[PDB]
Every structure is written in structure tokens, then in C-alpha cells.
Write a protein that holds these residues in place. Structure first.
Motif, PDB file in Angstrom:
ATOM      1  N   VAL A   4       0.283  12.695   6.092  1.00  0.00           N
ATOM      2  CA  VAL A   4      -0.291  11.354   5.949  1.00  0.00           C
ATOM      3  C   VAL A   4       0.749  10.359   5.417  1.00  0.00           C
ATOM      4  CG1 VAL A   4      -1.211  11.687   3.587  1.00  0.00           C
ATOM      5  CG2 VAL A   4      -2.323  10.057   5.178  1.00  0.00           C
ATOM      6  N   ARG A   5       0.743   9.147   5.960  1.00  0.00           N
ATOM      7  CA  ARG A   5       1.628   8.112   5.467  1.00  0.00           C
ATOM      8  C   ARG A   5       0.949   7.416   4.292  1.00  0.00           C
ATOM      9  NH1 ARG A   5       4.527  11.053   8.854  1.00  0.00           N
ATOM     10  NH2 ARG A   5       5.636   9.907  10.522  1.00  0.00           N
ATOM     11  N   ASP A   6       1.515   7.583   3.099  1.00  0.00           N
ATOM     12  CA  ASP A   6       0.975   6.968   1.897  1.00  0.00           C
ATOM     13  C   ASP A   6       1.591   5.588   1.728  1.00  0.00           C
ATOM     14  OD1 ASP A   6      -0.024   6.216  -0.561  1.00  0.00           O
ATOM     15  OD2 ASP A   6       0.755   7.952  -1.656  1.00  0.00           O
ATOM     16  N   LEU A   7       0.801   4.572   2.081  1.00  0.00           N
ATOM     17  CA  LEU A   7       1.245   3.180   2.108  1.00  0.00           C
ATOM     18  C   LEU A   7       0.748   2.392   0.900  1.00  0.00           C
ATOM     19  CD1 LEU A   7       0.653   2.418   5.915  1.00  0.00           C
ATOM     20  CD2 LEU A   7       2.651   3.470   4.845  1.00  0.00           C
ATOM     21  N   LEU A  70      -7.919  11.163  -3.307  1.00  0.00           N
ATOM     22  CA  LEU A  70      -8.433  12.535  -3.174  1.00  0.00           C
ATOM     23  C   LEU A  70      -8.636  12.960  -1.715  1.00  0.00           C
ATOM     24  CD1 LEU A  70     -11.089  12.689  -6.064  1.00  0.00           C
ATOM     25  CD2 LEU A  70      -8.733  13.527  -6.211  1.00  0.00           C
ATOM     26  N   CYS A  71      -9.141  12.051  -0.889  1.00  0.00           N
ATOM     27  CA  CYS A  71      -9.373  12.325   0.532  1.00  0.00           C
ATOM     28  C   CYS A  71      -8.130  12.091   1.373  1.00  0.00           C
ATOM     29  CB  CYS A  71     -10.508  11.451   1.070  1.00  0.00           C
ATOM     30  SG  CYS A  71     -12.096  11.879   0.364  1.00  0.00           S
ATOM     31  N   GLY A  72      -7.480  10.953   1.139  1.00  0.00           N
ATOM     32  CA  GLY A  72      -6.337  10.538   1.944  1.00  0.00           C
ATOM     33  C   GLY A  72      -5.182  11.505   1.890  1.00  0.00           C
ATOM     34  N   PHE A 127      -8.120   1.922   1.707  1.00  0.00           N
ATOM     35  CA  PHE A 127      -8.526   2.304   3.065  1.00  0.00           C
ATOM     36  C   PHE A 127      -7.867   3.590   3.517  1.00  0.00           C
ATOM     37  CE2 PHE A 127      -4.698  -0.217   3.689  1.00  0.00           C
ATOM     38  CZ  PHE A 127      -3.963   0.570   4.602  1.00  0.00           C
ATOM     39  N   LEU A 128      -8.554   4.257   4.446  1.00  0.00           N
ATOM     40  CA  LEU A 128      -7.999   5.343   5.247  1.00  0.00           C
ATOM     41  C   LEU A 128      -7.953   4.885   6.715  1.00  0.00           C
ATOM     42  CD1 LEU A 128     -10.297   8.084   3.626  1.00  0.00           C
ATOM     43  CD2 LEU A 128      -7.921   7.612   2.925  1.00  0.00           C
ATOM     44  N   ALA A 129      -6.784   5.035   7.331  1.00  0.00           N
ATOM     45  CA  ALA A 129      -6.578   4.668   8.710  1.00  0.00           C
ATOM     46  C   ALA A 129      -6.666   5.958   9.508  1.00  0.00           C
ATOM     47  CB  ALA A 129      -5.205   4.012   8.879  1.00  0.00           C
ATOM     48  N   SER A 182      -3.757   0.315   0.332  1.00  0.00           N
ATOM     49  CA  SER A 182      -4.497  -0.569  -0.544  1.00  0.00           C
ATOM     50  C   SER A 182      -4.725  -1.927   0.121  1.00  0.00           C
ATOM     51  CB  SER A 182      -3.738  -0.725  -1.857  1.00  0.00           C
ATOM     52  OG  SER A 182      -4.106  -1.896  -2.552  1.00  0.00           O
ATOM     53  N   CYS A 183      -5.798  -2.595  -0.290  1.00  0.00           N
ATOM     54  CA  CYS A 183      -6.120  -3.929   0.218  1.00  0.00           C
ATOM     55  C   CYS A 183      -5.594  -5.006  -0.735  1.00  0.00           C
ATOM     56  CB  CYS A 183      -7.638  -4.064   0.422  1.00  0.00           C
ATOM     57  SG  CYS A 183      -8.318  -2.858   1.595  1.00  0.00           S
ATOM     58  N   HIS A 184      -4.911  -4.585  -1.808  1.00  0.00           N
ATOM     59  CA  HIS A 184      -4.356  -5.506  -2.813  1.00  0.00           C
ATOM     60  C   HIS A 184      -3.030  -6.095  -2.296  1.00  0.00           C
ATOM     61  CE1 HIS A 184      -3.821  -7.397  -6.643  1.00  0.00           C
ATOM     62  NE2 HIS A 184      -2.972  -6.520  -7.147  1.00  0.00           N
TER      63      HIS A 184
END
Length: 187
Positions: A4-7, A70-72, A127-129, A182-184
């Protein structure tokens, strides 16, 4: 295997867009063969009936800070509506003000899933993409400034805008995550 790409530390909008675009492209190259991802409960020989559609844009599942981590990081997709429904949208993390995204998610999803948008905007601050499986159905189209945005549901109490297939029905399901973020966001 896909990592997963952790952005979550890519918070400038221009740069986030570039990373999400690249994440989808990298992910699709891993799908040139094999689109199944979850192993059968009833068969040691087999994967279940759920598969990803490779030729597709990213959709977003909005979540709180803890769920995203936890999910991502752990290949899990949470429900965000009752009867095990996961609602996703083409509406990207930078489109709407956070309070307005929450208002819409509340109109779109009831209470009883793992994520409950009725707790307020903190539940959509991350968010999760994902690339959606064949089990996601289009439930409506929002129009923002001349542009349509699909909404989609995997299970739940939804209709398109006896079951013989094997797939997961729970509030957390094993599912490939393309990116989390994040949406921040900032300029």
C-alpha cells in the motif's frame, strides 16, 4: 506483492494528485495477471468469487484517523453502512470541504457499519483509495460544477441507480488497498 502507498505525509494537493495517479498505474501493472485476492473458506484449492476490475479509476472510502492506519496498512476494507455495506465514491479527497463531504456521506450511508459517518467529519478526515471489485454497484451520480461523480456500494441495502457466489460478508473484509491518505490538504 503490492505494498500500500502510505500518502499520509503527502499533504500538498498537487503532489497528492501525482502520487495517487502513480499509485493506480503501479497497481494496474501488478494485475496484468491474476485479479482474485481472497481465498475460499469452503475450498483449500481455491480463491473465492470476488475479483478486481483492473481497467478502472480509483474510488475512495472515507475513514477516521485510526481506521486509515489499522485497515489501510493491513489489507482491510471496512463497512460504512448497515448490512455489511461499503460505500465508495469517485469524489476525490480534495473536492469538497470536510463538513460538506460528511453531510453527503450521512445522506448516503446509515448507521451500523464499522465506520459511522453520523459521528461527524472526523470519520471522513482520511481515505482509502481502492480499485473496486465486480461486487460494487453504481448507486448514484452527484454533479459538482458540471462534472458527474459516481457513488458505489458493495452489499448493504442499495439498488443499482439465490446468491451462489462466495465472498466476504463482514464489517472488516480482506481487500487490496491501493493507497491511504489524509484530507488535511494545503496548496
Amino acid at each position: 506483492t503490492w505494498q500500500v502507498r502510505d500518502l499520509r505525509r503527502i499533504l500538498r494537493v498537487s503532489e497528492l494528485r501525482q502520487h495517487l495517479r502513480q499509485a493506480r498505474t503501479d497497481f494496474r501493472s501488478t494485475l496484468s495477471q491474476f485479479v482474485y485476492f481472497n481465498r475460499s473458506v469452503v475450498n483449500p484449492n481455491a480463491y473465492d468469487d470476488e475479483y478486481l476490475l483492473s481497467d478502472q479509476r480509483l474510488t475512495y472510502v472515507y475513514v477516521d484517523e485510526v481506521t486509515a492506519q489499522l485497515c489501510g496498512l493491513n489489507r482491510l476494507l471496512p463497512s460504512n453502512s448497515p448490512a455489511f455495506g461499503t460505500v465508495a465514491t469517485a469524489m476525490p479527497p480534495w473536492l469538497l470541504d470536510p463538513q460538506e463531504m460528511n453531510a453527503i456521506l450521512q445522506q448516503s450511508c446509515g448507521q451500523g457499519g464499522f465506520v459511522n459517518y453520523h459521528h461527524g467529519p472526523s470519520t471522513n478526515s482520511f481515505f482509502l483509495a481502492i480499485l473496486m471489485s465486480q461486487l460494487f454497484i453504481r448507486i448514484r451520480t452527484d454533479v459538482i460544477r458540471g462534472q458527474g461523480y459516481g457513488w458505489y456500494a458493495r452489499l448493504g441495502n442499495y439498488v443499482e441507480e439465490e446468491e451462489t457466489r462466495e465472498f466476504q460478508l463482514s464489517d472488516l473484509i480482506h481487500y487490496p488497498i491501493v493507497a491511504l491518505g489524509s484530507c488535511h490538504l494545503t496548496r
